[PDB]
Design a protein around this ligand. Structure first.
Ligand SMILES: Nc1ncnc2c1ncn2[C@@H]1O[C@H](CSCC[C@H](N)C(=O)O)[C@@H](O)[C@H]1O
Ligand SMILES: Nc1ncnc2[nH]cnc12
Lengths: 233, 233
């Protein structure tokens, strides 16, 4: 049996998935929460990480360490940067880069940190399974580079800087690249499957308030089907 | 009765300290090596931190989670922000904050992340202990605020920002706050100590490779005295 680990940051991003877990058990390790059980017959371990890179890092580390899932899906909300994107649309990582790391003085690519690739690559089979679920579920989706940082992007210079440095980035958020970095170090396959809550302009906080519940529902639909698809056929 | 976790940025320090551990055992998890044993009769756990907040968090989490130390001592080198500091001063954190965290869109203080304090407070008796230890080595201990972030800040165009957003900040590097965050999450008292390698343009006498030779020796002795004085009571 495959065990699938699922990571979302916020209670609202995790609460629908957690309600669907059977035989559900809760583990606190300081003080992040991991819910274990079966989701549609598939062993899962669901982490609520909290917000940002170190919260994500510490939780992903405790998840891999304690529960030893075979695979990691990171779910939740994100700020759309691709032009097509509308609120509720799915984004799937083909890769993940930090938008706020810079050791370019020592020869690395912008966004790259030592001992890491410049971008972390999402596992191909997990990408293809997510795309299978997108098409089966008839969702609007875009596959691409997700960028992460300890900043909620809200227009102005913050946003401009990310579009200048990462013109191919499709979505921006605060945990995925930290999760991808942990999984590089543990050699565990990852994918991010998130939904758009805002478009990272100077209304993004208002949009996020308005549409976070839609982002959560849409990313939960994908994930709960993706765990079935991965764990069987 | 005590177990003391030691996390060092400077490789030569971690080396010298490892070589002093009795009944040493080594573990590898997630590409981190943790050494455990007795230093001068005290149960320790030892780890060299990686570069940036995720790598450091990961390392910290695995130390704290596997070895359950009573306290964290976190060592390294930093850049000086206060024009009043001298290359060779040792900063002892009273507080750590992120210089590159921005959730101000939702009203948080700059550098603050949701669910966290705006700064992570160093433990007062470990600060005091670290200070005595520094002064007894004939070294100059300066207490205050350390900021960290995943951009290397030497020069720039940049460094204000840092002083603009954090007057009060006296030192900057890339891991401290991340280690401070994890310790706060596990409720483990910490102290962050940092040898000052350069001060903002008091441009500069000894190369970093030469600074590090001396710093890593002074810091090694500092750590073995601090471990003893904390054990003693
Ligand atoms: C997505 O969406 C989340 C932003 S939440 C930032 C706002 C936060 N909930 C607050 O205190 O306001 C991150 O977890 C990101 O990765
Ligand atoms: N605009 C935004 N910036 C960063 N993380 C986000 N998650 C959702 N919307 C976001």
């Amino acid at each position: 049996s495959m065990k699938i680990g699922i990571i979302g940051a916020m209670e609202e991003e995790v609460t629908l998935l957690r309600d669907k877990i059977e035989n559900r058990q809760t583990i606190t390790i300081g003080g992040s929460e991991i819910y274990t059980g079966q989701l549609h017959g598939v062993d899962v371990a669901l982490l609520k990480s909290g917000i940002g890179k170190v919260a994500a890092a510490m939780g992903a580390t405790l998840l891999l360490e304690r529960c030893q899932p075979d695979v990691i899906i990171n779910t939740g909300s994100a700020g759309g940067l691709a032009s097509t994107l509308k609120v509720g649309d799915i984004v799937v990582s083909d890769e993940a880069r930090y938008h706020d790391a810079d050791v370019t003085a020592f020869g690395y690519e912008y966004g790259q940190l030592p001992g890491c690739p410049a971008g972390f690559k999402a596992d191909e089979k997990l990408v293809a399974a997510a795309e299978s679920c997108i098409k089966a579920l008839d969702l609007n989706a875009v596959r691409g580079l997700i960028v992460s940082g300890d900043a909620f992007i809200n227009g102005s210079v913050g946003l401009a800087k990310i579009r200048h440095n990462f013109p191919q980035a499709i979505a921006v958020e605060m945990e995925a690249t930290a999760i991808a970095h942990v999984c590089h170090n543990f050699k565990v396959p990852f994918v991010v499957v998130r939904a758009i809550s805002d478009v990272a302009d100077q209304q993004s906080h208002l949009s996020f308030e308005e549409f976070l519940a839609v982002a959560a529902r849409q990313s939960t639909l994908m994930v709960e089907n993706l765990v079935q698809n991965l764990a069987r056929g």
